């Protein structure tokens, strides 16, 4: 079944706070409650514990991530840039 047309996870808020605010909250809530594959062990068991803290239930590893996503695009771009600018210094 579907149980809902568009409100999705944001249906717990009823008719309150306004549609635009409900959509904005839903956008972050979906990613913040989603499950993620562990980079270290490969299991789909990484979940958010605190605002910027993501832990794997299987391999028990904890990593520092984004507020509502495990990795932010800024950090990914910074990692790529760091690798490039470090390799051009090393060799």
């Amino acid at each position: 079944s579907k149980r809902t047309k568009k409100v999705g996870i944001s249906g717990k808020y009823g008719t309150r706070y306004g549609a635009s605010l409900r959509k904005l909250v839903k956008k972050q809530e979906v990613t913040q409650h989603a499950r993620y594959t562990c980079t270290f062990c490969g299991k789909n068991s990484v979940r958010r514990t605190a605002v910027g803290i993501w832990s794997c239930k299987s391999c028990k590893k904890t990593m520092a991530g984004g507020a509502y996503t495990v990795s932010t695009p800024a950090a990914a771009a910074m990692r790529s840039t760091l690798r490039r600018l470090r390799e051009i210094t090393e060799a």
Binding site: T37, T39, F40, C41, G42, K43
Partner: protein
């Protein structure tokens, strides 16, 4: 290399392999392992242990660039595989290089 996937598919189709850490260690101990594959995201301690076992067995090691998910998919399974051993390479030439 990219050809490792085709070689692995041929080896599984024709020869025989063991998938998993315990079976790989058993093969290395018994000396019937011809080559071992270790996934990139294998834990460092386990990877070093497997490398030491293969040094003892004089068995070649290939460091598969993919994760355990990708290694299992290459082996044609629906589960992950952190490490595996090839006990018999058949029509494939995986042991040539």
């Amino acid at each position: 290399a990219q050809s490792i996937g085709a070689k692995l598919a041929l080896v599984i189709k024709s020869g025989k392999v063991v998938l998993g850490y315990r079976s790989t260690l058993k093969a290395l101990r018994s000396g019937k392992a011809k080559l071992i594959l270790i996934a990139a995201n294998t834990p460092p301690l386990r990877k070093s242990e497997l490398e030491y076992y293969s040094m003892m067995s004089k068995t070649p090691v290939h460091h598969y660039s993919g994760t355990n998910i990708e290694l299992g998919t290459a082996c044609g399974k629906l589960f992950r595989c952190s490490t595996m051993a090839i006990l018999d390479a058949g029509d494939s030439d995986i042991l040539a290089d």
